[PDB]
Structure 1
């Protein structure tokens, strides 16, 4: 079939990542113009997305060039965090650099090395202005707060960020040596609260508990089981095939009520009153499960039992056989707490400890998700805060400063590749450009003055571009782990350079 040559392979390389790189641009740096996601192709929707990864897969990523940064940026946010928005823009900033060098016909080798060369030198330079805010654990808690402060920024959350700051701080604090991402348990629901993020005792659970069965339980010790039925039990008797007539199509459904009743007895051999069958039951089952005295509580969470398998000293395993196979979960009070017209069976009497369940009650499931990545990134980057107390100053205050030496380097350091390294030290400052003008400031007096203001050593001085100004990073508290700065480059660093040296595309 097809053999593509470099020009398109390079230009399509240029356009797509640039085309996607400017999707979140005005949403990047500090907040400029936001980014509205219009979905006209697959549905009809009005959507607001400042997230690359969101924006990535929503719009068609099928541009093979876009696929690169779509992948690379996605991987980066998935690793170090909040890297997608970065990487998507960063290599997009990069593509424009060599594009001139490509236009200048600078050897593809030259731009590869020089950037990657300068990629070290800047992160090298990024290593210095990286400053430990976490030496003292309370200052580290304060380090955890400011580093989480730059993470939760720029997205859309009303009151939510305040719960996640301390929590990304607290997930680290109680765990001793890492943050709690999994010990934290994400519950995203619509409750009586248009904006809430709070701590969940045990983990809440949704159901309407009606009919005869007592709707509360006391002194719960849970028998943890993954084995059970829905309309047909898993056992020797769990299958019956009989229809000879049209009455039988009616009769075949009645014998389904035969299969539920025999397990209702089986929970009584263990005699255990608190038993999780993690598969659902209905009211008519709740009618039947209320007769025996051993209740089957339906739809028990896996991670919520893992939540319990953490603190309770119990076990999360699969299937089930007898009470000693999977250790007995225990919760002081399993209760049904009604949120709105609907009631919620709530596993409680177990509060935080080794783990956390976090129930977010938003006005929308939309507001519930944007806080997760905010949390998820603030969790990981505060786990980066753990080992490295270093926070290098945000608002691209590193970028210009990363660009400072590399500029000064590129002149000196290469006697050729300054083309790339300057271009490197050039593109680093694009992120400040797109915001500082979005800020109302003049980026020209930002990327370079404030650069040589902070790059010559006032690093707290940085972008407050939501005031349209230079701003004090430590004072603004706008800073994030030095570890969040490096790899988002290193991803984006190769995000560009791949398609740069890609000179051909074969197509089946």
Structure 2
């Protein structure tokens, strides 16, 4: 249909105004003294939330161009939360600082591509300086400590996570589900974790962790591309009776199939989600048979001749739970016999020895690690059920923070790590003055989280920030207690990965927006 086209400054201020509504709404939540946001609901009483991600999910603008802005930085910032388990909000407020001052500079006549190069350079520097500031978390004393701090000072959670990591190792797979009673349980079951995301959002039935959660679903396994509901319909109507959900693992699910799936599960007919089968070529189908072994299903390939129309309920795979992130599919407790799976580990481990090249060796060992290693399960005991759902949540959160900390360590939270790292870069320069401006734009941007945190507390951001730069290392301001001192010892810290990802993603989308000269949307 006819388009509205906007250029240059015209487009830029629209974008800016848009990210300003997104950010200004999202960032009032930021401190420990962060405020509430009220989100209306058609049915019932409005939601009161301090969760910036909940707020962001609800922000869409009337003006088409502004909306494009807000939606751009939503989409890119959400990737922070998806990588490190937190920092999407942080990414939003950083993005707003960089985009604001950046466009400001653009409009004085500086070269946007140079500004971008200067920003990107400064950001890379900042990540190095951040890797220096990082304090490792390795020994399980510190693992339990961080899990605890992430549990809102609950030593039970730190304890729990630390133990699951002592069992399946730092590298291993850990889930948490409803408890059966007062006391917590930990068990290791048949299960796997591999890289596939939901093929579309809206598949998500649990928006708090941003994932698709399915209990006792049937699992379809097909090596082929599925574009058509013609091949699907018999199995849809066969699952409809039995009354269980469905998870699709195929070479892909495209067009008519995927759209008809989104609509079909939106209407309440046979709720289904879909993922991509991991790998390509031969390793793809090999892994698809690893799944066939694990869930006790059977693979449908056009290569051996069986088709999707030929599929009944017995050909279907089943497991007691599956969880699907933006980027990750993990399977817990497949019906598949321990005979079949042990035999699979045997066959592939036999395939391991013949490797001439290291590559095949490592891929097969990846497969066996995932399949034989299984999955660690945490059942969370609360007494009353309400406490259970709540504590389960805290444990999930604490778990993500702890994985992140295990990987890249921890740095001072409260956004003082950013201001710190930023202050170590005062002498960083580029190839031309525009690049230099770009650098100082990003270094100034890096003080926005702490300044906002302080602002929410009703204190003077300029002063606090000044004082925090004055110090060195993990010395910072504890917003809760209004006390300066070592932020880590005070127990206020972020996994290094989330701060880094926040900054990287923020700078990414800002860079694109600064270098954007044309916007094309539909007509009102």
Q: 2:450 aligns with which of 432, 454, 457?
A: 432
Written as runs of structure 1 = structure 2, the 5 A alignment for 1:461-476 is 461-476=475-490
1:57: which partner in 2?
A: 57
1:478 partnered with 2:479: no
1:170: which partner in 2?
A: 163
Deviation, structure 1 residue 120: 0.6
Written as runs of structure 1 = structure 2, the 5 A alignment for 1:52-131 is 52-60=52-60, 63-131=67-135
- TM-score, scaled relative to structure 2: 0.59
2:307: which partner in 1?
A: none
Q: 1:36 to 1:165 in 2, by over 3 A?
A: farther
Q: 1:398 to 1:230 in 2, by over 3 A?
A: closer
2:427: which partner in 1?
A: 408
Which of 1 and 2 has greater Rg? Answer: 1
Aligned length, in residue pairs: 367
In the alignment, the residues of structure 1 paired with residue 337 and residue 470 of structure 2 have an alpha-carbon distance, to the nearest angstrom, of 56
RMSD of equivalent CA atoms:
4.3
In the alignment, the residues of structure 1 paired with residue 388 and residue 89 of structure 2 have an alpha-carbon distance, to the nearest angstrom, of 18
Deviation, structure 1 residue 475: 1.2
In the alignment, the residues of structure 1 paired with residue 218 and residue 340 of structure 2 have an alpha-carbon distance, to the nearest angstrom, of 12
In the alignment, the residues of structure 1 paired with residue 14 and residue 240 of structure 2 have an alpha-carbon distance, to the nearest angstrom, of 53
In the alignment, the residues of structure 2 paired with residue 498 and residue 468 of structure 1 have an alpha-carbon distance, to the nearest angstrom, of 37
1:502: which partner in 2?
A: 516
In the alignment, the residues of structure 2 paired with residue 502 and residue 481 of structure 1 have an alpha-carbon distance, to the nearest angstrom, of 32
Written as runs of structure 1 = structure 2, the 5 A alignment for 1:76-475 is 76-134=80-138, 137=139, 141-148=140-147, 151-152=150-151, 162-181=155-174, 184-187=175-178, 198-199=184-185, 301-303=320-322, 307-309=332-334, 313=338, 355-359=376-380, 368=389, 372=393, 375-388=395-408, 390-410=409-429, 415-453=433-471, 457=472, 459-475=473-489
In the alignment, the residues of structure 2 paired with residue 26 and residue 150 of structure 1 have an alpha-carbon distance, to the nearest angstrom, of 23
1:2: which partner in 2?
A: 4
Structure 2, unpaired ranges of 5+: 190-215, 220-237, 244-317, 324-329, 345-373
Written as runs of structure 1 = structure 2, the 5 A alignment for 1:13-52 is 13-28=15-30, 30-40=31-41, 42-52=42-52
In the alignment, the residues of structure 1 paired with residue 217 and residue 33 of structure 2 have an alpha-carbon distance, to the nearest angstrom, of 51
Deviation, structure 1 residue 97: 1.7
Contact 1:149 1:478 in 2 (8 A): no
Deviation, structure 1 residue 46: 2.5
- TM-score, scaled relative to structure 1: 0.61
Deviation, structure 1 residue 58: 2.4
Q: SS state of the match for residue 517, structure 2?
A: coil
1:294: which partner in 2?
A: none
Contact 2:27 2:52 in 1 (8 A): no
Contact 1:70 1:88 in 2 (8 A): yes
Q: SS state of the match for residue 496, structure 1?
A: helix
Structure 1, unpaired ranges of 5+: 154-158, 204-223, 234-298, 317-323, 326-352
Q: SS state of the match for residue 427, structure 2?
A: helix
Contact 1:73 1:491 in 2 (8 A): yes
Contact 1:450 1:461 in 2 (8 A): yes
1:33-73 deviation line (CA, Å, top 9, x unaligned): 32323215x44432233333322222327811111121112
